[PDB]
Design an enzyme around this catalytic site. Sequence first.
Site, PDB file in Angstrom:
ATOM      1  CG  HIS A   1      -1.496  -1.283   1.595  1.00 43.04           C
ATOM      2  ND1 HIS A   1      -0.998  -2.001   2.649  1.00 43.04           N
ATOM      3  CD2 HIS A   1      -2.461  -2.049   1.023  1.00 43.04           C
ATOM      4  CE1 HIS A   1      -1.655  -3.138   2.744  1.00 43.04           C
ATOM      5  NE2 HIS A   1      -2.555  -3.187   1.769  1.00 43.04           N
TER       6      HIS A   1
ATOM      7  CG  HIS B   1       1.714  -4.290   5.266  1.00 41.15           C
ATOM      8  ND1 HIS B   1       1.703  -3.721   6.534  1.00 41.15           N
ATOM      9  CD2 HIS B   1       1.268  -3.335   4.412  1.00 41.15           C
ATOM     10  CE1 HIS B   1       1.301  -2.470   6.435  1.00 41.15           C
ATOM     11  NE2 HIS B   1       1.029  -2.189   5.148  1.00 41.15           N
TER      12      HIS B   1
ATOM     13  CG  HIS C   1      -8.096  -2.374   3.082  1.00 39.24           C
ATOM     14  ND1 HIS C   1      -6.869  -1.802   2.783  1.00 39.24           N
ATOM     15  CD2 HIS C   1      -8.066  -3.633   2.599  1.00 39.24           C
ATOM     16  CE1 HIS C   1      -6.104  -2.700   2.213  1.00 39.24           C
ATOM     17  NE2 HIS C   1      -6.823  -3.832   2.076  1.00 39.24           N
TER      18      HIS C   1
ATOM     19  CG  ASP D   1      -6.642  -0.149  -0.390  1.00 36.79           C
ATOM     20  OD1 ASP D   1      -5.783  -0.017   0.506  1.00 36.79           O
ATOM     21  OD2 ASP D   1      -7.887  -0.009  -0.245  1.00 36.79           O
TER      22      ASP D   1
HETATM   23 CU   LIG Z   1       0.167  -0.778   4.063  1.00 36.80          CU
HETATM   24 ZN   LIG Z   2      -6.276   0.210   2.467  1.00 35.52          ZN
END
Ligand SMILES: [Cu+2]
Ligand SMILES: [Zn+2]
Lengths: 153, 153
Positions: free
Chosen positions: A46, A120, A71, A83
């Site tokens: 992201h 992530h 999200h 996103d």
């Molecule tokens: Cu992120």
């Molecule tokens: Zn998001």
Amino acid sequence: MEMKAVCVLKGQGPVEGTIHFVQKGSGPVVVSGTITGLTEGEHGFHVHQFGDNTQGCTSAGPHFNPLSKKHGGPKDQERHVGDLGNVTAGKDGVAIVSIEDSLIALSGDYSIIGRTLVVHEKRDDLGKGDNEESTQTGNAGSRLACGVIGIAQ
Amino acid sequence: MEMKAVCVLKGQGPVEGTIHFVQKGSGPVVVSGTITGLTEGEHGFHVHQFGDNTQGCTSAGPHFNPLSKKHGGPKDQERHVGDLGNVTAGKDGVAIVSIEDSLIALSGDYSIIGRTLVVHEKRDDLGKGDNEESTQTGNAGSRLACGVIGIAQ
Ligand SMILES: [Cu+2]
Ligand SMILES: [Zn+2]
Ligand SMILES: [Cu+2]
Ligand SMILES: [Zn+2]
């Protein structure tokens, strides 16, 4: 017309990366790059709001969300501007980043220049998860590495 | 209408700092914060063209210069947009940064968002040195520390 950007992903861990962006006029943003040092499988990807690195990746704040949306993955009508969904690492610990996105920009209100790109610990559930967290972060967990998105030659 | 930015300066050496920017509408940009680890005296201080950290401070490129001018001091008509002159470190190697500038911006064509802030080894001669190098860099010499300028809360 033709805008370019670069991001150097760095973290406390061994996750490193270089991502390139190009946008030809009103054309889509084409994202190309690699991330190394990853665990095998899917990892959330992201654009976060702030290009602030005073607190490693913490100071990047939340997903860039100029519309006040929930999200999602890149394909869903309901998504954060930021996103970009998931990148898939192989058993070598490397993901090829290859994304085409029309919502992000390198100019105008949706520009991601001077905001933070983040990869992530875990898979982004694309906001299809059951619990509250899915509607916010897609349950992607920890921020492994980040960088400020910079204007490039 | 108020815009804020932040830059963390990092090098291969003892020089480091956090720099804050604020711009109210189309007004001056107010630059503040602290740099440590500097030699006593004046140090060149500029915004460079690219927010590219693929080769430390080198990939930042030359001074930000959208009007295609020669180098100068911030008070000069003939200057690059990125020319913020000198910061001054005392005995203790601390520079308190306090600058207001009318050419840089945090939005539009003069935006330094996604570009690189650089602090130099030597004083910027403000384009008055009478060699070609003065007219490009002010003879400020090497790049002690730099960072990509990011959007801040
Ligand atoms: Cu992120
Ligand atoms: Zn998001
Ligand atoms: Cu410089
Ligand atoms: Zn200059």
